[PDB]
Design an enzyme around this catalytic site. Structure first.
Site, PDB file in Angstrom:
ATOM      1  N   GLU A  35      17.025 -24.963  44.989  1.00 13.41           N
ATOM      2  CA  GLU A  35      16.816 -26.084  44.080  1.00 13.41           C
ATOM      3  C   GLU A  35      15.706 -27.041  44.545  1.00 13.41           C
ATOM      4  O   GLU A  35      14.858 -27.458  43.746  1.00 13.41           O
ATOM      5  CB  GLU A  35      18.102 -26.898  43.887  1.00 13.41           C
ATOM      6  CG  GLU A  35      19.185 -26.237  43.018  1.00 13.41           C
ATOM      7  CD  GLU A  35      18.793 -26.106  41.550  1.00 13.41           C
ATOM      8  OE1 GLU A  35      17.722 -26.597  41.163  1.00 13.41           O
ATOM      9  OE2 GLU A  35      19.567 -25.513  40.771  1.00 13.41           O
ATOM     10  N   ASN A  46      12.074 -32.284  33.390  1.00 13.92           N
ATOM     11  CA  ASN A  46      12.709 -31.304  32.514  1.00 13.92           C
ATOM     12  C   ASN A  46      12.041 -31.380  31.122  1.00 13.92           C
ATOM     13  O   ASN A  46      11.432 -32.398  30.752  1.00 13.92           O
ATOM     14  CB  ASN A  46      14.212 -31.590  32.377  1.00 13.92           C
ATOM     15  CG  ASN A  46      14.967 -31.488  33.702  1.00 13.92           C
ATOM     16  OD1 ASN A  46      14.740 -30.579  34.494  1.00 13.92           O
ATOM     17  ND2 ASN A  46      15.898 -32.403  33.923  1.00 13.92           N
ATOM     18  N   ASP A  48      13.261 -31.778  28.010  1.00 14.37           N
ATOM     19  CA  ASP A  48      13.663 -32.840  27.108  1.00 14.37           C
ATOM     20  C   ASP A  48      13.233 -34.246  27.558  1.00 14.37           C
ATOM     21  O   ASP A  48      13.612 -35.241  26.928  1.00 14.37           O
ATOM     22  CB  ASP A  48      15.174 -32.782  26.871  1.00 14.37           C
ATOM     23  CG  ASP A  48      15.992 -33.024  28.145  1.00 14.37           C
ATOM     24  OD1 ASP A  48      15.413 -33.113  29.249  1.00 14.37           O
ATOM     25  OD2 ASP A  48      17.227 -33.121  28.038  1.00 14.37           O
ATOM     26  N   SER A  50      13.959 -35.622  30.559  1.00 17.45           N
ATOM     27  CA  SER A  50      14.762 -36.098  31.676  1.00 17.45           C
ATOM     28  C   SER A  50      14.119 -35.536  32.949  1.00 17.45           C
ATOM     29  O   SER A  50      13.126 -34.807  32.875  1.00 17.45           O
ATOM     30  CB  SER A  50      16.224 -35.673  31.517  1.00 17.45           C
ATOM     31  OG  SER A  50      16.358 -34.273  31.475  1.00 17.45           O
ATOM     32  N   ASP A  52      14.957 -34.018  37.204  1.00 18.89           N
ATOM     33  CA  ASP A  52      15.925 -33.616  38.243  1.00 18.89           C
ATOM     34  C   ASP A  52      15.514 -34.288  39.541  1.00 18.89           C
ATOM     35  O   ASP A  52      14.339 -34.239  39.916  1.00 18.89           O
ATOM     36  CB  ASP A  52      15.939 -32.115  38.528  1.00 18.89           C
ATOM     37  CG  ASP A  52      16.288 -31.299  37.351  1.00 18.89           C
ATOM     38  OD1 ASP A  52      17.448 -31.307  36.896  1.00 18.89           O
ATOM     39  OD2 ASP A  52      15.362 -30.611  36.888  1.00 18.89           O
ATOM     40  N   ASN A  59      20.266 -33.996  37.359  1.00 21.08           N
ATOM     41  CA  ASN A  59      19.657 -34.372  36.100  1.00 21.08           C
ATOM     42  C   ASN A  59      19.960 -35.770  35.590  1.00 21.08           C
ATOM     43  O   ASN A  59      21.123 -36.134  35.400  1.00 21.08           O
ATOM     44  CB  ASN A  59      20.088 -33.336  35.065  1.00 21.08           C
ATOM     45  CG  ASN A  59      19.219 -33.316  33.833  1.00 21.08           C
ATOM     46  OD1 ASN A  59      19.387 -32.449  32.992  1.00 21.08           O
ATOM     47  ND2 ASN A  59      18.280 -34.231  33.722  1.00 21.08           N
TER      48      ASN A  59
HETATM   49  C1  LIG Z   1      21.549 -29.268  34.358  1.00 24.14           C
HETATM   50  O1  LIG Z   1      21.475 -29.373  32.937  1.00 24.14           O
HETATM   51  C2  LIG Z   1      22.668 -28.909  32.303  1.00 24.14           C
HETATM   52  C3  LIG Z   1      22.417 -28.910  30.807  1.00 24.14           C
HETATM   53  O2  LIG Z   1      22.049 -30.207  30.360  1.00 24.14           O
HETATM   54  C4  LIG Z   1      23.819 -29.804  32.688  1.00 24.14           C
HETATM   55  O3  LIG Z   1      24.997 -29.270  32.077  1.00 24.14           O
HETATM   56  C5  LIG Z   1      25.622 -30.025  31.111  1.00 24.14           C
HETATM   57  O4  LIG Z   1      26.370 -31.038  31.787  1.00 24.14           O
HETATM   58  C6  LIG Z   1      27.101 -31.879  30.878  1.00 24.14           C
HETATM   59  C7  LIG Z   1      27.730 -32.984  31.711  1.00 24.14           C
HETATM   60  O5  LIG Z   1      28.374 -33.951  30.891  1.00 24.14           O
HETATM   61  C8  LIG Z   1      28.108 -31.036  30.077  1.00 24.14           C
HETATM   62  O6  LIG Z   1      29.060 -30.459  30.955  1.00 24.14           O
HETATM   63  C9  LIG Z   1      27.384 -29.917  29.325  1.00 24.14           C
HETATM   64  O7  LIG Z   1      28.326 -29.050  28.698  1.00 24.14           O
HETATM   65  C10 LIG Z   1      26.556 -29.110  30.316  1.00 24.14           C
HETATM   66  O8  LIG Z   1      25.800 -28.132  29.621  1.00 24.14           O
HETATM   67  C11 LIG Z   1      23.988 -29.818  34.211  1.00 24.14           C
HETATM   68  O9  LIG Z   1      24.986 -30.756  34.593  1.00 24.14           O
HETATM   69  C12 LIG Z   1      22.677 -30.158  34.902  1.00 24.14           C
HETATM   70  N1  LIG Z   1      22.846 -29.932  36.328  1.00 24.14           N
HETATM   71  C13 LIG Z   1      22.636 -30.906  37.211  1.00 24.14           C
HETATM   72  C14 LIG Z   1      22.889 -30.544  38.671  1.00 24.14           C
HETATM   73  O10 LIG Z   1      22.200 -32.011  36.894  1.00 24.14           O
END
Ligand SMILES: *[C@@H]1O[C@H](CO)[C@@H](O[C@@H]2O[C@H](CO)[C@H](O)[C@H](O)[C@H]2O)[C@H](O)[C@H]1NC(C)=O
Length: 129
Positions: A35, A46, A48, A50, A52, A59
């Site tokens: 990562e 990212n 959209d 946002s 990381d 994120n």
């Molecule tokens: C990476 O991006 C993923 C997609 O946006 C994100 O996953 C989402 O997290 C949400 C948290 O409320 C929810 O569970 C969505 O269903 C899920 O797709 C993920 O958390 C991100 N990873 C990190 C480490 O930031």
């Protein structure tokens, strides 16, 4: 700060990640390797809009506030800059929430693609934990 492999393994273990939610330590070290390449200062934009942040590439769309992701969520209740500290505490506490969010470590794409299903123990091999 760029951590040494065993240095990070030790720091993560101390913060209680070894087996947190059933994911052995090697999983976490492997995720951090791919990562951010063990660099706490890693940032990647990212699609959209946002971004990381940190060693675990958390994120801003959901977990932290960077003041430039209109309508995002800050579920870890912290400014994203806190995730870039040489002290991984904030990154670890936030990751603990993420992994408990229902999808386990699949939240980390590098983990799903390059760690999941591999001999993750190789990542803490040689370390004095
Ligand atoms: C990476 O991006 C993923 C997609 O946006 C994100 O996953 C989402 O997290 C949400 C948290 O409320 C929810 O569970 C969505 O269903 C899920 O797709 C993920 O958390 C991100 N990873 C990190 C480490 O930031």
């Amino acid at each position: 700060k760029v951590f040494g492999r065993c240095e990070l393994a030790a720091a993560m273990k101390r913060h209680g990640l070894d087996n947190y939610r059933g994911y052995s330590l090697g999983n976490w070290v492997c995720a951090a390797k791919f990562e951010s390449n063990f660099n706490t200062q890693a940032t990647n934009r990212n699609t959209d809009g946002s971004t990381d942040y940190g060693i675990l590439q958390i994120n801003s769309r959901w977990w932290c506030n960077d003041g430039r992701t209109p309508g995002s969520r800050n579920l870890c209740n912290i400014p994203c800059s806190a995730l870039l500290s040489s002290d991984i505490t904030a990154s670890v506490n936030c990751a603990k929430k993420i992994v408990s969010d229902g999808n386990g470590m699949n939240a980390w794409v590098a983990w799903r693609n390059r760690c999941k299903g591999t001999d993750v123990q190789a990542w803490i091999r040689g370390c004095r934990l």
